[PDB]
């Protein structure tokens, strides 16, 4: 489209399926062609909110999501959208304390 004001927009570079123990700290790092106006994050066919575990952000053209308090729970794909896109990224809680439950 020429002299246009609203354009599609897409990802320049996608997620990064991430591994991290839990309880730890999972930042979603990604990019887009243009400045999302807004980025609605989802975890789990769930809908995310800047809140204090996930506490995303906007750097122009780079976009990222900090989730502290990871748990065995958070294991899910995650989809950041941002009004034409959505990207997706899987994550790995682990578990900093592996003992032998048969015991």
């Known amino acids: 489209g020429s002299s246009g004001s609203s354009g599609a927009n897409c990802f320049t ?13 999972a930042v979603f790092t990604c990019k887009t062609e243009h400045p999302a106006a807004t980025v609605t994050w989802r975890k789990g066919l769930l809908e995310l909110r800047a809140s204090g ?11 990222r999501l900090t989730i502290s308090a990871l ?5 899910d794909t995650y989809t950041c959208d941002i009004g034409q896109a959505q990207s997706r990224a899987q994550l790995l809680v682990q578990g900093r304390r592996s003992g032998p439950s048969s015991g």
Do not use: F, M, R
């Open 13 to 25: 570079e996608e997620l990064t399926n991430l591994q991290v123990e839990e309880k730890g700290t």
């Open 53 to 63: 575990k996930h506490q995303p952000s906007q750097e122009g053209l780079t976009l």
């Open 71 to 75: 748990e065995k729970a958070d294991s």
